[PDB]
Structure formats: C-alpha cells, structure tokens
Design a protein around this nucleic acid. Structure first.
Ligand SMILES: Nc1ncnc2c1ncn2[C@@H]1O[C@H](COP(=O)(O)OP(=O)(O)NP(=O)(O)O)[C@@H](O)[C@H]1O
Ligand SMILES: [Mg+2]
Length: 508
RNA sequence: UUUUUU
C-alpha cells in the first residue's frame, strides 16, 4: 500500500457541525444529536477526521490525537452518518465493528453511542450491542437478535467467540472496522486476534474481501504502526491524519508532571501515602485521584493500605482484571459520577477510560509498557480541564525516565528526592494485616513484572531485581530477611546459579 | 507479569 501523511496545519479554516451540515457531509439528524450536547465546538481531531472518514475515496484512516480530546466521537459521528447514508440497505445488519483492548473501554464506547441516542430518539433505529467477556453470552445474542444492531462494540476474545458461530447471520455486510487504542491492539497477544477478526469479516463480506475500510485511533501512533497493521488494512491508500507535530511529545502539555525519586521501591508506597494525606488536608477532602500499580496482587495490597489510612476521608475503589465484571462496571459508573475518591488500578484502566474531573494521576512504579506512561497521566486533564501527575519510583527505575526522554521526547521538569520518616513507616506497616506468605506472593508478582520490562526500560537486572525483592524485608520490618523459597522453584525461574537470585532469595 | 472468549 501507500501512506499519505496529512500533518498539523497552522491556520486551517475551522470546521463546525453547522459547516458540515451545509456541505452535505452531515445529515440533520446527527447534527442535531451532537449540537444538543452543548459542546463549545468540534475538537481538532473531530474537525480533521469526520469528512475524510465519510469521503467517497477508497482509503483506510489512521488518526493520532492527544488524550482527552474527543477521539471517540471522531469515529462515532461519521459511523452514524454512514448508517443514515445507507439506511435502506441491509438494515438488520452490522455495518460498523469497533474493537477495544478492555471490556470497560468497550462498554464506555457503547455508553457514548447511547448518549447520541438520548439526544435524538430518531437515531435509536441504528441500534448497538456490546460483546465483551465476563457478560452472559446468551443474553448478548438475544440482544443481537432482538435489536439487529448496525453497530457492534467488542473486546477481541468475545468477538472471535461470536464470529465463529454467527458471522453469517449478522456480519456479512460490515463496511467499517475501528481499532481504538490501535497501537495496543497490534502488540503481541492482540495482533493475532485482530488478524483473525479481520480475516473472518473479510471472507464473509458479501461485496468483496477488500470492502471493509479500517480506522485506527490512538494518542500513541507513528508510521511504524501502519506496517504492523498491514495484514488487516484492505485499501490501496492510507490517510495519516495527525493533530500532533512530528517532534512534539505525545503527552498532553496541560498536565503538570513530576517524579518523586526514592532510594527503595517500597519507599514509593510511603511517599504516595504522605502525598495523598497532604492533598486531602489542603483540598479539604475534595480530591479525586487515580493511582496505578504494576500488578493485580500489589494493587489489592495497595488498596488495603489506602483504606486503612483514608477510608474515613474518601472512598477507595479497587479496579483490576480479577474484580468481577459486574463490579468493574458498577465501580466505573460510580467513579465517573463521583466528585472525589481514589481509584486504585492496574493498567486495565490506563487507556481510554474517561473519568471527569480527576485532579491527579499517581503512579507507584512503572507502567506495563512505555506508551502507557502517556495514557496513564492522560486520565487527568481531559476535555479542557487541568490536572497534575506524580510518578513515584526508586533510583534503580530511573532508566525508565531516561527512555521517556530518548524514545518519546518527554522531559519531566519537576523532580525531587524522598526519604521516609520512621513515623510514617510504623503508621503504614502496623496496619498491614497480610501474612508473610501473602507479602511473598505480592513481592514475587512484582519481580515477574519488573523482570519482563528490564530490556524495554534499560534496567540493570543486577540492581533492579534485588531492590524489588528486598521489598519483602521492608514490609516485614527486617531488611536482612530474604524471601523464603524452595530449590525446585528457583530452578524454574532460571536463577539457581545466578548471584542475582542469591541476593533475592533464601532457600528455606 | 498487564490485558484479552470459555
Ligand atoms: N467537541 C467536544 N467538545 C467538548 N468536549 C468533548 C467534545 N467531544 C468529546 N468531548 C468530551 O471529551 C471527553 C473525552 O473524550 P474521549 O473521546 O474519551 O477522548 P479520547 O481522545 O478518546 N481520550 P484517550 O482515549 O484517553 O486517548 C468526553 O467526556 C467527551 O464528552
Ligand atoms: Mg479514547
């Protein structure tokens, strides 16, 4: 194929809903829906993508725009227009398939489609069904059958599951497929799923294998992502529509970034607590924050510490892949509505989730991938609002911060050191009710986590892994102590002849 | 180890 760049222009003539209506691009019914939301105007990415997506040209579209700047409606608006344009054809059939990397993000995109319905009841005829894991499969299919949706929103696993059994019934007339958070959906462990999805939709399509037009959206995207998307893009040319300069960092400039550097990984726990205590005092409990952690087990632990310190001041919500899907959904609903509170999560909540008026994003440790730094802090400072972020790390994670500068051109101006008082250590540790076995599970999860990103973030394995393991002794308040392990376990990790493993583990 | 059908 061939890539057509369309970079960020200086004084490009503003595009509005009114202008698009008069031009023939938008029908009155979708113009009225969006107009009724009382937005000041269309965001830059919306201004840039709406007509090119709807255009009669035979192209795929790639779009980059910063966090919180309205990518969702950037694709929903033209999708609706396409359904109106073709209202008399295959009306009981799926014409647009939107795919997301998490269930909660798919369900949020569905809720945004519902907001379009709620603003113009005349658009309800273009029905929508979400197909995501952790929901009753049969009930969703009853919904497919009852509503005969034109729009499907899905996570990959559940979509493949459905496609293998019912692609002929609902999916032989798909015109558009959208990968939101496209870069994530083309990493290893999603790429093969997307290629299966793409191959099934293409083989089943009633006009041809190259009918489907593909749209990719992310805050983090380059030309290299078009290469990764090669087996799933049908068209002869690809528009790259960019609202961010070539060199400009992908992080949203309105975010006030800082990093707090400790000598030990565990000390980031105490720094975080002192930070939150201070923000609750200074803001008189009017504090809405999200705090990210590396693993499910440490997220749970972190939540217990924060409930013991702060449950009296603020609700504390625990959000990760092992929370049941019903509770994930209810807590997302609550946290979107609430004025204050602390959401404690893994990267399940790093991308896409739109929680209005979060004041701060806090990170304890590193994200699951470089890019997810940009997405994490992007949970704040959304839709014109302000926001700040704090990264709590230890000295041995500093090469992560240098990689942000080298790879993504992100330079964090505010940087300071931290050392915990014995008073804060005692306060936090004495209310830890986890058993030694539990602390071991927790720290072990962090070792596996850090080990998997050593190369990506240029860590010194010899320094970072022993530091992470020594968390165990910090938390049991004896820092001579090593994690008690068996020989057959240490052989499984491949460290039985390593000095690095000798410094982390005791063979009890 | 983060997500992602069952
Ligand atoms: N034209 C607009 N004017 C003002 N607000 C808008 C507009 N379009 C969308 N929004 C709001 O902006 C918020 C963020 O939109 P969203 O589509 O989630 O951003 P995004 O670019 O997908 N962010 P991310 O997924 O984190 O990269 C939502 O609460 C929308 O209601
Ligand atoms: Mg988004």
């Amino acid at each position: 194929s061939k890539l057509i760049h369309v970079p960020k222009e200086d004084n490009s003539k503003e595009v509005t809903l009114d202008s698009l209506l008069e031009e023939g691009v938008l029908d009155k019914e979708i113009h009225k829906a969006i107009t009724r939301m009382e937005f000041p105007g269309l965001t830059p990415v919306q201004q840039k993508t709406i007509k090119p997506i709807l255009s009669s040209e035979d192209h795929d579209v790639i779009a980059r725009a910063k966090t919180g700047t309205g990518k969702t409606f950037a694709f929903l608006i033209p999708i609706f227009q396409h359904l109106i344009n073709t209202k008399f054809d295959s009306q009981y059939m799926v014409k647009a398939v939107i795919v997301a990397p998490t269930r909660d993000l798919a369900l949020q995109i569905e809720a945004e489609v519902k907001k379009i319905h709620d603003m113009n009841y005349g658009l309800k005829k273009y029905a929508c069904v979400s197909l995501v894991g952790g929901t009753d499969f049969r009930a969703a299919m009853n919904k497919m059958n009852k509503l005969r949706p034109n729009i499907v929103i899905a996570t990959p696993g559940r979509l493949i599951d459905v496609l293998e059994k019912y692609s002929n019934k609902f999916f032989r007339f798909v015109d558009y497929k959208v990968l939101d958070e496209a870069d994530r959906l083309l990493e290893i462990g999603f790429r093969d799923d997307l290629e299966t999805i793409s191959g099934i939709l293409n083989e089943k399509n009633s006009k041809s294998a190259d009918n489907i037009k593909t749209l990719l959206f992310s805050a983090t995207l380059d030309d290299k992502v078009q290469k990764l998307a090669n087996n799933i893009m049908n068209k002869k040319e690809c528009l790259f529509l960019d609202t961010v300069d070539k060199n400009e960092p992908e992080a949203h400039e309105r975010i006030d970034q800082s990093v707090v550097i400790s000598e030990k990984f565990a000390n980031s726990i105490f720094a975080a607590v002192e930070h939150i205590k201070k923000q609750i005092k200074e803001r008189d409990s009017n504090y809405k924050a999200i705090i990210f952690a590396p693993t499910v087990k440490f997220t749970s632990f972190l939540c217990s510490i924060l409930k013991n310190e702060f449950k009296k001041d603020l609700p504390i919500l625990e959000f990760h892949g092992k929370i049941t899907q019903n509770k994930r959904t209810s807590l997302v609903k609550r946290f979107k509505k609430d004025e204050s509170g602390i959401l404690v999560c893994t990267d399940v909540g790093a991308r896409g989730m739109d929680f209005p008026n979060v004041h701060e994003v806090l990170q304890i440790g590193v994200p699951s991938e470089l890019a997810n730094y940009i997405h994490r802090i992007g949970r704040t400072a959304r839709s014109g609002k302000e926001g700040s972020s704090v990264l709590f790390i230890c000295k041995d994670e500093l090469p992560f911060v240098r990689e942000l500068e080298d790879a993504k051109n992100i330079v964090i101006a505010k940087q300071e050191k931290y050392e915990p008082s014995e008073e804060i250590k005692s306060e936090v540790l004495e209310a830890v009710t986890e058993e030694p076995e539990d602390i071991s599970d927790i720290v072990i999860s962090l070792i596996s986590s850090y080990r998997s990103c050593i190369k990506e973030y240029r860590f010194s394995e010899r320094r970072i892994l022993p530091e992470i393991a020594s968390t165990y002794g910090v938390l049991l308040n004896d820092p001579q102590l090593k994690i008690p392990v068996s020989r057959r376990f240490l052989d499984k990790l491949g460290l039985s002849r390593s000095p690095i493993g000798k410094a982390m583990f005791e063979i009890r």
